[PDB]
Write a protein that binds this ligand. Structure first.
Ligand SMILES: N[C@@H](CO)[C@@H](O)[C@H](O)[C@H](O)COP(=O)(O)O
Ligand SMILES: N[C@@H](CO)[C@@H](O)[C@H](O)[C@H](O)COP(=O)(O)O
Lengths: 365, 365
């Protein structure tokens, strides 16, 4: 039972202050800035010997990799490859004995991610499971793993499991660099953001009524282009998938740096556009993308941060989310897009929890 | 002057039997199965010492990397990473002294690809230029390079330059494995396909009138989903971009293995779909994607090969292209999509050569 909510998905979205706390429970100690993933305690030293991280997954679990890639590169200093499992297998991707391969899966039974796992094992790679289902195939067949501990997720369109996968990979990253003197201030910045994150998610959830009103403006449209870069590239892909999944509107994520390489031809006053701009090191380049969409008569809705005075000042339609650290900001930025997919589906008369043509786990072929 | 054609783009498309011959001229000897890229003659041995290939580009030049990745993995046995240049830079991607980095660019002046190049040089990586413009910045600042020799390309939506980039990267691959006894039959298979390719492209071009008729069926639509996998993933992305660029229809490339992970919710009898199915090792899995689109009331147009009796037999709308080798087939499969973008733009009244909001080369920011 979902008692208090009319759907599992809305309950799962509004559960994210608690699911994030649950993911970090018994793991992150805020008194002494320590993180310990017991499921990885044995194997961590072996992992630090490896020469490359490969993150292998499908759909939203794939996006959680795209969302943490840069901070994994930053803090591990290893090359990080993120791969859609179906294509990884079609190409007979080269994998080596000193590769560590991560398998990201809410269900733990996704057929292509699991066959990806067995392919890598057969080549002698170290395998790590990041899942939300204890006792699943992927959880059982990996060498080590982390249970994200988000609790059961019933809505086919994933919400809390994405944000808990994201926190889980950030925690792995923090363990990886815990012996580096030069990285200790960075780690402490990150851990203080994680401490603050539950309260900041409660604050994003208070904008539900405002997002319902924007859904009211959009539910007759047939397309929407969601543009972001850097840390927010994953957020645009993930919001795009969520809207496709339960609303059946043609939403597409566009890498903002690619705009002038073709997609900008789609922009005029009739194409709905959502732009994400955060105050990280991509800010000036995102301000360029925005200016270029407006120059071509686009009328974008802009997801920015609450303290971004210059874009709030100069832009009429803003969804203003709280400010966090650059590599956690996408946990906050994705939530209005989760809520927008939900409200659009309600307005169109569609089943938010069990959309047409889809299942929670794709276990066959 | 384009004399004989009403546009540069259609002339460039119909030039592809000759541009392919021009790309291979003085390079591939069919009498003794030798390939020699003189621009790489000095540096080839150093390249074979390197531990990873990174392919860095924007838009269609990016797609040429996606299109040759698998055969580069196959024949070099190296890891191959393909990167959108804007994102490569946003993430401060780790690059090493024993990386070989390829910069793919028709113009040779694309700002993000060029800044990508300088970033890699500064870290001591070996840099290789694949371009269509002699004397360009990228051509001049790399350590070595190949001029694809396609001739001037005026149409903003790239055609011959894509297929010549593709052949150029296949030729590099063949040079890389020319000392391996076990790979000699494979190389000879590939070189015999390249020998046959110009005549097979003439045969695809003879279906112009048939593609004009399909454009006639589609030019009132607002969306189209183009689905493929494996070797044809690049083809679906590239056709999708070409239709966006000059027709302004919302065309999106979908990885066919990802269908059941969300995008299948978009499929019903009103969503136009183009599916690509080739007789390579992904055939049975592509037949599964097709069956799943039809099960959900989709009415796909299917690009298949002429000798694919089972899908011709069981499917009403086929664009039947000649059969080639698996890793060259996308040179043939992309051409109907080039011609479809062209005819759609004509029917809608748009400038095929100089679309709105775009330029041939993005040299600034
Ligand atoms: N249900 C979709 C997400 O909202 C889908 O893309 C999903 O992520 C995919 O099927 C993989 O499932 P997994 O996370 O259980 O492996
Ligand atoms: N004109 C477009 C291709 O049709 C665009 O995506 C293009 O590939 C991109 O701007 C990169 O240009 P380049 O190949 O000159 O580097």
């Amino acid at each position: 039972m979902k008692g208090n909510f009319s759907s599992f998905m809305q309950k799962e979205i509004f559960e994210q202050p608690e699911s994030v706390v649950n993911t970090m429970r018994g793991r992150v100690n805020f008194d002494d800035y320590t993180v310990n993933l017991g499921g990885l305690k044995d194997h961590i030293k072996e992992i630090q010997r490896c020469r490359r991280l490969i993150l292998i997954a499908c759909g939203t679990s794939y996006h959680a990799g795209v969302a943490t890639r840069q901070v994994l590169e930053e803090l591990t200093e290893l090359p990080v490859m993120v791969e859609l499992a179906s294509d990884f297998l079609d190409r007979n991707t080269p994998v080596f004995r000193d590769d560590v391969c991560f398998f990201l899966s809410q269900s733990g039974e996704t057929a292509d991610t699991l066959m990806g796992l067995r392919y890598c094992k057969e080549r002698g790679a170290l395998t790590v499971g990041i899942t939300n289902t204890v006792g699943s195939s992927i959880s059982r067949e990996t060498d080590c793993g982390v249970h994200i501990n988000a609790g059961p997720e019933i809505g086919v369109a994933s919400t809390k499991a994405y944000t808990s996968q994201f926190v889980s990979l950030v925690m792995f990253a923090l363990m990886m660099c815990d012996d580096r003197i030069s990285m200790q201030e960075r780690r402490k910045e990150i851990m203080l953001g994680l401490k603050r994150l539950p309260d900041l998610i409660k604050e994003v959830l208070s904008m539900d009524d405002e997002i319902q009103k924007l859904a009211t403006e959009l539910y007759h449209q047939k397309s929407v282009l969601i543009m972001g870069r850097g840390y927010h590239y994953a957020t645009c892909l993930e919001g795009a998938l969520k809207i496709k999944e339960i609303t059946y509107m043609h939403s597409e994520g566009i890498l903002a740096g690619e705009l002038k390489h073709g997609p900008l031809a789609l922009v005029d006053k009739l194409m709905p556009v959502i732009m994400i701009i955060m105050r990280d090191h991509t800010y000036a380049k995102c301000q360029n993308a925005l200016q270029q969409v407006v120059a071509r008569q686009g009328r974008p809705v802009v997801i920015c941060d609450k303290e971004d005075t210059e874009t709030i000042k100069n832009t009429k339609r803003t969804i203003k989310v709280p400010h966090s650290v650059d590599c956690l900001q996408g946990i906050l930025s994705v939530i209005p897009l989760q809520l927008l997919a939900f409200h659009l589906a309600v307005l169109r008369g569609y089943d938010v929890d069990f959309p047409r043509n889809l299942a929670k786990s794709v276990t066959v072929e």
